[PDB]
RNA sequence: GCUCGCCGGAAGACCAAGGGUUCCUGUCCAACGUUAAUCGGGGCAGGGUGAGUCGACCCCUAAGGCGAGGCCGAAAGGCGUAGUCGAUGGGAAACAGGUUAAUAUUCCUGUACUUGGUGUUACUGCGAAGGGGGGACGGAGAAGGCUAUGUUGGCCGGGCGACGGUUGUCCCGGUUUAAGCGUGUAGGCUGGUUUUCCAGGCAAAUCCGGAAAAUCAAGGCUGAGGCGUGAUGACGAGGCACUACGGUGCUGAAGCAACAAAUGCCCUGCUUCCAGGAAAAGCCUCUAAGCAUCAGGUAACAUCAAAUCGUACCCCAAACCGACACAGGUGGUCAGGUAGAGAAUACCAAGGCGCUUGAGAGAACUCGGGUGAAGGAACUAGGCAAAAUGGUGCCGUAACUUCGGGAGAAGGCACGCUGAUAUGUAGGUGAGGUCCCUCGCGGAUGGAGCUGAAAUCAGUCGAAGAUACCAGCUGGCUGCAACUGUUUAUUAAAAACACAGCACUGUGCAAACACGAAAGUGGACGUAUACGGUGUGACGCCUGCCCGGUGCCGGGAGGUUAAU
RNA sequence: AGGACCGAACCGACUAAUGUCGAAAAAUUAGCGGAUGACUUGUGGCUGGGGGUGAAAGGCCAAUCAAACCGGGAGAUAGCU
């Protein structure tokens, strides 16, 4: 019963991290759609 | 060389080894080695372009001297070796000056022979020189297609190309496929067949031997579903189609060649 | 050379505790509280300048912040850096 | 606290990942805890994570990512050169003891070691993005040497036993010591040294590669381990003091041999096999531009520095992934005794637990088991499930066979303990002393001691000696698939898929083909003994007729026919 | 030597019972197959939606797959309830 979420902070940050978002045009627009909604935690960094 | 293996195990029952006992047992010559990472068939875009590739043993790359661009300098063979990147073997040769280079191993090239390239080469096998100094009718291998290009024809195990004619600046060559083809008289070529002519006689016995040469299984489009292959579907071994590749194009006889740039050199196409 | 304007900023407070008094008695170490930045060189010079003692070696460690809730809202105390400053022989005050 | 019981290749111990204070102390019992709770991984407060050497960081790179310029693309952007990042790999150095309520290779005691700086002194050619070396590499097998460790004996301390006996071949406990430093072993590999030259190592090289000549035959490298020092130190069963009755205080004897021994280490070795088994820095060396008296390099001293981050705790789980204090999942490391081939299994050690509702009762019925008269598949869709067989040695073993198999076919017999052969043998180990020498960690000896199976004979006990756990049911005919394998995560594991093998077919390399508006990439750093597609599916014997339809290959007499 | 044999770790999942508001949104118990290899596993990476990958089952692509999930077109449309 290997559940789907097997955590790893390295994989987490390289996939959904801030720098991961900011690398690409489409990700720089996820941070825009989150600053829009006014999210406290923009990305996964903690 | 060609030895049938005793059936002490199913999967050993049909193996036919090719045990050439003069290959240098041990490690290759380091300065002529380099990384060679398996691709998996995958390409630039990371998608499989060539199917049924991936796996098998890790194998280094042996920088083979194909140009053979050392003239006047005689070279002595010193080691016949096993190259996993070819079907032929290779032959570490040592020049008078002190350079070592792997070359394809011809049929009679044994450790101790002497060879040299350039127009002043003798026509004993293992020598390379332009197919303007080589006599018509001779058997040659490691043929170039453009002068200095490097050597692209007759490189497999036991494959050779014979200079059939010579119409001034060009040279007709009966390629191992049966097709004749003009090749500029300056295109260098090395004499005699290539070694390891028994290569074709191994039988591999089992599926794992296909595997560890980097060959993944090949599904028959008949077994697939209508979505995967043009063949496919049908409530139990139904075909009704003309045999086509997985991409619709017809196979079982359909000329896919279209070059129009090099067909001026193809004197007589293969048979 | 460390500027005294920084040396007067480094040290925060003496850390008083059972283990701190224990280290003082049986090992002549003054447990301290220093700023988070606080290189060991920073701390050693600050001690030798502001207490005028002779330090043999410093051994820092960063203490994390307890997640201390206050009522319903969740809280988080701050990280701080401890400094086990071992004096040679001289004295503490 | 005593007794009982459970795990003990784990249900113990240490980690990584992940978590994030759950760690320790005091304190409280509302809520949380499937019950009560004084207790807690709960609430509140305080404390606790100490590094030149252990990880990270850092240096170097793999796959891969990004990518100045560049090429391509309606725009976004795609690809990619230099370059730059990217461990899961490569790169310097610390161990033992003690100590905390909670940290320890971090603190303290002792004993080290590494890399840089900076002077000093003395010798001095130094100088890199560049050359060369090394780093640096597989699978399997076979041993031999040793160690971890264990067992026994000795030695030391203690006891002489609640019930027959227990001054003895008696019982109990201990019998530990590291890094480092110095030897340089069992071993493994290499032939050394010198002079001369050389179209090769993108220049240069005094280095590597090469050709010789001389000259010697040994030199060199690697290396477990052991041995000495480290260490007359620590540790040490216990004893004597006092009590928070929880440990601090002091002292502390012996501290050895033999045998067995690893899956650990020599071994990145050796032997072999084909499938032919990273890179790059660190390190060594060579010169270039440059200085060349300098600078810089070397060695001895002296001192300096070694930053920052992590360090508590769980980690096969109540702390991580599963909504839960969830019978699930989770990579690595260490692995004691007896019996055992064994990391199985049984019982135990160190250690840790009794799984967070109990108390009774002793209905039906359900679940997990034990036993069963006579019969023995009559059950049933079906011997489903149970039952049964189950080990080692020797004898023996059918059709068929592709000569390997089938086969552990089938079947039969023996098995405990005691004694003798032989107060323990064959074997293994191997002491002293005796020599011999290039004297060593040497060699021949030489057999004390230890260890020690197996067998034969005789006796003896039981219903039963493979006595428990553990541990094949067997045989006949037949369909299909050659076989091993893969398969529908979560109702289908098959005859399906794959396969080796066979054939047809395309493809001459700017290969076909595929991904791509393109560039480009794979194919392949391959070259027709290669590569793709399709079908069939080992092997043996073979694979017959039909070219009308459809497709493909070619042909050109004519008909028809687009843009123009 | 072996895609050899028996058999633990390890991987898998053939049968049966249980469980079926479960201890568990696929497990437990007892047996079962492979167990030096077409093996298994840790870390990191690459491939993406008419697309990927597929020893091929329409299998898998985050408990979702004959076309994922999220947001939008969007208050789709619904002679139907």
């Amino acid at each position: 019963m290997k559940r789907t979420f097997q955590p790893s902070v390295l994989k987490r940050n390289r996939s959904h991290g801030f720098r991961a978002r900011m690398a690409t045009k489409n990700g720089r627009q996820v941070l825009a759609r989150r600053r829009a909604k006014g999210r406290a935690r923009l990305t996964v960094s903690k | 060389a060609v030895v049938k293996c005793k059936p002490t195990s199913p999967g050993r029952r049909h193996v036919v080894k090719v045990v050439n006992p003069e290959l240098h047992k041990g490690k290759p010559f380091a300065p002529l080695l380099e990384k060679n990472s398996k691709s998996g068939g995958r390409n630039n875009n990371g998608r499989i372009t060539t199917r049924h590739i991936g796996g098998g043993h890790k194998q280094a790359y042996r920088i083979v001297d194909f140009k053979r661009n050392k003239d006047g300098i005689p070279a002595v063979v010193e080691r016949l070796e096993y190259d996993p990147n070819r079907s032929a073997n290779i032959a570490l040769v040592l020049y008078k000056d002190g350079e070592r280079r792997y070359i394809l191993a011809p049929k009679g090239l044994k450790a101790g022979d002497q060879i040299q390239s350039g127009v002043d080469a003798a026509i004993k096998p293992g020598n390379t020189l332009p197919m303007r100094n080589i006599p018509v009718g001779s058997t040659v291998h490691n043929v170039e297609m453009k002068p200095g290009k490097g050597g692209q024809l007759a490189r497999s195990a036991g494959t050779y190309v014979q200079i059939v004619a010579r119409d001034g600046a060009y040279v007709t060559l009966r390629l191992r496929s049966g097709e004749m083809r003009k090749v500029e008289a300056d295109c260098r070529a090395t004499l005699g067949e290539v070694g390891n002519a028994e290569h074709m006689l191994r039988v591999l016995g089992k599926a794992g031997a296909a595997r560890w040469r980097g060959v993944r299984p090949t599904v028959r489009g008949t077994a697939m579903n209508p979505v995967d292959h043009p063949h496919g579907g049908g409530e139990g071994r139904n075909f009704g189609k003309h045999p086509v590749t997985p991409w619709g194009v017809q196979t079982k006889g359909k000329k896919t060649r279209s070059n129009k740039r090099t067909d001026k050199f193809i004197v007589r196409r293969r048979s | 050379m460390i500027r005294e304007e920084r040396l007067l900023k480094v040290l925060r407070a003496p850390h008083v505790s059972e283990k701190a008094s224990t280290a003082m008695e049986k090992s002549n170490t003054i447990v301290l509280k220093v700023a988070k930045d606080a290189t060991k060189a920073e701390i050693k010079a600050a001690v030798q300048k502001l207490f005028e003692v002779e330090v043999e070696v410093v051994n820092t460690l960063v203490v994390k912040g307890k997640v201390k809730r206050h009522g319903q809202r969740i809280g988080r105390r701050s990280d701080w850096k401890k400094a086990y400053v071992t004096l040679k022989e001289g004295q503490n005050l």
Side-chain angles (χ1 to χ4, degrees):
Chain A
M1 299 272 83
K2 195 178 180 199
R3 293 315 173 185
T4 70
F5 176 51
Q6 298 302 315
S8 159
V9 166
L10 183 51
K11 275 190 167 188
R12 183 162 204 81
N13 296 308
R14 286 182 184 173
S15 189
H16 325 303
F18 180 77
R19 300 189 53 77
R21 304 297 201 203
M22 282 285 302
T24 65
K25 192 269 292 178
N26 285 162
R28 292 199 284 270
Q29 296 186 358
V30 166
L31 321 173
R33 294 199 310 264
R34 283 177 88 69
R35 296 185 173 116
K37 208 184 213 214
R39 287 276 177 173
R41 275 81 51 81
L42 218 52
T43 65
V44 288
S45 313
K46 196 184 295 176
Chain B
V2 183
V3 307
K4 194 85 197 175
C5 277
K6 309 199 55 179
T8 64
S9 317
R12 201 64 180 178
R13 168 182 289 283
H14 298 297
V15 183
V16 167
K17 302 174 86 183
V18 184
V19 195
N20 178 5
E22 285 197 18
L23 304 180
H24 159 75
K25 292 195 160 184
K27 301 310 177 176
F29 180 67
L32 298 160
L33 300 172
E34 75 194 351
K35 200 186 75 206
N36 193 37
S37 291
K38 300 177 280 177
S39 316
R42 279 65 171 176
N43 72 314
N44 224 10
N45 298 0
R47 306 202 194 172
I48 305 178
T49 50
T50 320
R51 284 182 319 175
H52 326 296
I53 306 197
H57 210 293
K58 162 193 286 191
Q59 57 197 9
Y61 182 78
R62 274 83 174 167
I63 314 173
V64 164
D65 181 21
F66 274 129
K67 325 294 210 62
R68 318 269 327 257
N69 49 67
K70 292 197 93 169
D71 294 351
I73 294 191
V76 61
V77 181
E78 47 203 4
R79 277 202 263 155
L80 261 190
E81 298 189 354
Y82 175 103
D83 190 349
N85 325 300
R86 319 302 156 87
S87 40
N89 302 142
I90 63 184
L92 182 68
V93 308
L94 183 40
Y95 295 79
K96 281 296 173 60
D97 53 5
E99 201 206 345
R100 278 170 184 78
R101 284 185 190 192
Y102 287 143
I103 65 166
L104 279 179
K107 185 186 175 160
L109 194 67
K110 74 201 180 308
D113 290 305
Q114 189 101 345
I115 55 175
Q116 68 184 263
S117 68
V119 290
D120 47 59
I123 318 287
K124 68 191 189 298
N127 290 94
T128 197
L129 68 164
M131 283 179 311
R132 176 186 293 271
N133 303 114
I134 303 186
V136 177
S138 56
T139 182
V140 304
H141 74 285
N142 198 12
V143 194
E144 294 178 357
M145 278 189 177
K146 296 172 186 181
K149 178 73 171 293
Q152 321 199 318
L153 299 167
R155 304 202 324 198
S156 291
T159 47
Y160 62 110
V161 165
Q162 184 179 0
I163 300 165
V164 157
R166 168 156 209 267
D167 313 63
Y170 273 30
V171 162
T172 315
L173 299 166
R174 190 186 320 266
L175 308 168
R176 202 42 178 72
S177 62
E179 156 195 326
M180 292 204 179
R181 169 207 169 80
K182 278 200 175 186
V183 161
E184 183 176 0
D186 274 355
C187 309
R188 184 166 292 183
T190 316
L191 290 156
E193 300 178 358
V194 195
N196 220 15
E198 318 93 14
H199 171 92
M200 59 169 302
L201 301 166
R202 62 181 74 253
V203 172
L204 305 184
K206 55 172 189 184
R211 299 308 304 258
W212 66 59
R213 269 139 182 285
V215 175
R216 287 185 38 75
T218 317
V219 183
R220 305 172 292 99
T222 319
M224 310 188 183
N225 277 281
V227 54
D228 316 289
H229 205 267
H231 317 168
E235 289 303 323
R237 281 163 190 168
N238 300 346
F239 197 65
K241 264 83 75 184
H242 296 100
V244 298
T245 75
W247 300 273
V249 175
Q250 199 259 333
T251 177
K252 296 296 196 64
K254 163 155 178 60
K255 302 278 172 315
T256 74
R257 168 171 170 95
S258 306
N259 210 6
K260 285 199 176 188
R261 169 200 63 260
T262 47
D263 61 348
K264 60 193 58 53
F265 312 131
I266 303 191
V267 174
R268 187 179 316 211
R269 297 235 48 208
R270 50 158 177 97
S271 309
Chain C
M1 178 83 47
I2 306 161
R3 296 191 178 262
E4 206 193 351
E5 300 95 7
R6 173 63 171 161
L7 290 180
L8 292 158
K9 299 259 192 45
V10 173
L11 300 164
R12 311 320 302 177
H15 186 60
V16 284
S17 76
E18 310 84 3
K19 160 151 181 159
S21 41
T22 292
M24 156 55 53
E25 54 165 70
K26 72 187 49 180
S27 198
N28 207 15
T29 298
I30 57 170
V31 188
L32 288 168
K33 282 183 190 205
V34 301
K36 186 65 60 59
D37 307 64
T39 311
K40 285 177 188 173
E42 283 320 300
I43 298 173
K44 181 190 87 175
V47 175
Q48 284 186 306
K49 166 65 71 75
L50 306 192
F51 301 160
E52 285 177 25
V53 286
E54 55 273 6
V55 187
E56 193 142 48
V57 55
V58 189
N59 289 303
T60 46
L61 77 95
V62 164
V63 192
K64 265 68 193 185
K66 279 216 185 59
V67 172
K68 286 289 194 171
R69 89 171 44 258
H70 187 266
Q72 180 69 44
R73 284 160 285 178
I74 189 52
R76 176 58 176 259
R77 279 175 176 163
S78 174
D79 294 0
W80 51 280
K81 176 189 276 194
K82 199 177 310 186
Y84 287 88
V85 181
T86 65
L87 310 174
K88 276 163 194 160
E89 291 281 10
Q91 187 177 359
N92 189 16
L93 285 175

